[PDB]
Amino acid sequence: APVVIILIILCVMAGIIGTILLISYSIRRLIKA
Amino acid sequence: DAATSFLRAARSGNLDKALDHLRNGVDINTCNQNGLNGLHLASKEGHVKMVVELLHKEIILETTTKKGNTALHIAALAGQDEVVRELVNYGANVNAQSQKGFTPLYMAAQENHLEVVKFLLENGANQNVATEDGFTPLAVALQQGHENVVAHLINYGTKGK
């Protein structure tokens, strides 16, 4: 159960960072062209 | 045994024992396992009389060791001012380079031997000769903090011989 909570926290942080980077990369590829 | 005794006498400065071995027939050009002959060993220890006597008996002045060091290289690294002067007076090449590209000036400068540096410069040592690392005598004295040497090398610049 503590392992599940720690993995959940890591998943939340990874998802936040990945979504922000994906949005930034999509905006960059739409904007440069 | 005879060659080993002669080299030991040359290292210790026992000129009489070394002069005896040459009378008895010990070749003057014999060297130890490191390639150092009697002239190299005398130059290391500052034995000026032994150096002169060996030069008179026709030792090869530009013989290099297994590291490529001449007698002038060893005398400059050991800081033997009188031996350096005597070797230069008999025609030692002041611009000789060892296997790794060191000159007598580089060895004198890295070791803060100001008198040897001044004498080698007055004898036409070119301070632009770099080693395989690209280092000059000026560069090594800066790294090692040798400020008296750094001053003399820059202030001489190229007064040449």
Binding site: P2, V3, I6, I9, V12, M13, I17, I20, L21 | -
Partner: protein, 388 residues
């Protein structure tokens, strides 16, 4: 992107604040904590300042990594000890958080000069997760004695860093780098970290030791192990160097190997003679590792270790684990043989696997990794003054 690092720092700090709000609630060990604190922030950070053009990054990224690490390690270790429940914070929680920071800094020593601060934040998070899980496994499942943490901190951090550095291998740096060189005053500054680590290591190995005989032995055994380690490290540096000259790399690092190798046996009744034996062997092993195994790892195994953490933390940590096993063999401790061996194996294996996964994540070209020519240079991430 120049905004990746501030974004990740702010997001991680906000996550830390939220996790503390969700999980965290509110004096004889405080001086030992402060000793460990000085070891974490002054010791490692200034120990890594030997690089001539990477001192700013060394000390500053040490501070940043350890500051993030204490918070994240507090959260993870507390969650493990509380099984997902709320937990209180004492001096022991702060000490253990500093220990997690120490593990991450040991791994940082392997990748120093080739990684970005963003990569360091990511490595801090992932490595603390892996380290805390392995340390919980050793302490509660195996119930092995590792009071000085030769296995759970030093060996783990070293092999985690080695796995990361192996994944992050650059072909252009195998033969060397012009920035990868020390300076005179840089080595003088590194001596500060060396001396503080040496002076305060007895508190490192005895902070969470059981009060009474164990804590006293942890202090006495660490002290004499370091005393023997200094002499043997000096002796072996001269023996492996031309004309017997001392190498500052050896005197900066191998002098501390006795503290690492005595950690498992610190609290055990091994006696002050046995602690000195361990320290001497640690110093010898560390010097031999720097001179012969680090070139072998860099050139042949393609594992470049900037600070030689394999020689200070990895090999001495393994030696400490083996010393713990042998001490169990001869009655110095009541812990089992198999549990000490399993702790050593689990620490090394978990470190390698976690380092592989973390390095695979760090290899994505999203973190502003320096170019090959720009490695070991402060100017990639810092404003550098014009004069030294």
């Amino acid at each position: 992107m120049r905004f990746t690092f501030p974004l990740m720092a702010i997001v991680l700090e906000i996550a830390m604040i939220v996790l503390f709000g969700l999980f965290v609630e509110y004096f004889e060990l405080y001086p030992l904590f402060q000793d460990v604190h000085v070891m974490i922030f002054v010791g490692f950070g200034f120990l890594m300042t030997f690089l001539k053009k990477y001192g700013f990054s060394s000390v500053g990224i040490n501070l940043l990594v350890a500051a993030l690490g204490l918070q994240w390690g507090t959260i993870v270790q507390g969650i493990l000890q509380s099984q997902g429940q709320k937990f209180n914070i004492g001096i022991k929680n702060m000490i253990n958080a500093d220990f997690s920071a120490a593990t991450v800094l040991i791994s940082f020593g392997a990748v120093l000069g080739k990684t970005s601060p963003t990569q360091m934040l990511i490595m801090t998070i992932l490595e603390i997760v892996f380290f805390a899980h392995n340390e919980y496994l050793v302490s509660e499942i195996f119930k092995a004695s590792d009071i000085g943490a030769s296995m759970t901190i030093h060996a783990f951090g070293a092999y985690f860093g080695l796995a990361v550095a192996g994944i992050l291998y650059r072909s252009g740096l195998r033969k060397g780098h012009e920035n990868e060189e020390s300076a005179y005053y840089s080595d003088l500054f590194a001596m500060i970290g060396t001396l503080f680590l040496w002076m305060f290591w007895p508190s490192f190995n005895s902070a969470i030791a059981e009060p009474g005989d164990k804590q006293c032995r942890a202090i006495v055994n660490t002290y004499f192990s370091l005393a023997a380690c200094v002499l043997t490290a000096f002796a072996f540096s001269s023996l492996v160097e031309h004309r017997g000259k001392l190498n500052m790399v050896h005197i900066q690092n191998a002098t501390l190997a006795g503290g690492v190798a005595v950690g498992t046996c610190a609290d055990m009744a091994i006696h002050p003679f046995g602690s000195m034996i361990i320290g001497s062997i640690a110093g010898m092993v560390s010097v031999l590792g720097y001179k012969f195994l680090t070139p072998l790892f860099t050139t042949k195994l393609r594992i470049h270790d900037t600070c030689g953490v394999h020689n200070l933390h990895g090999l001495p940590g393994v030696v400490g684990g083996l010393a713990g096993i042998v001490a169990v063999a001869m009655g110095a401790s009541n812990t089992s043989m198999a549990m000490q061996a399993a702790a050593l194996g689990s620490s090394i294996g978990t470190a390698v696997v976690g380092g592989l996964m973390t390095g695979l994540i760090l290899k994505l070209p999203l973190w502003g990794q320096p170019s090959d020519q720009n490695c070991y240079d402060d100017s990639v991430y810092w404003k550098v003054p014009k004069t030294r």
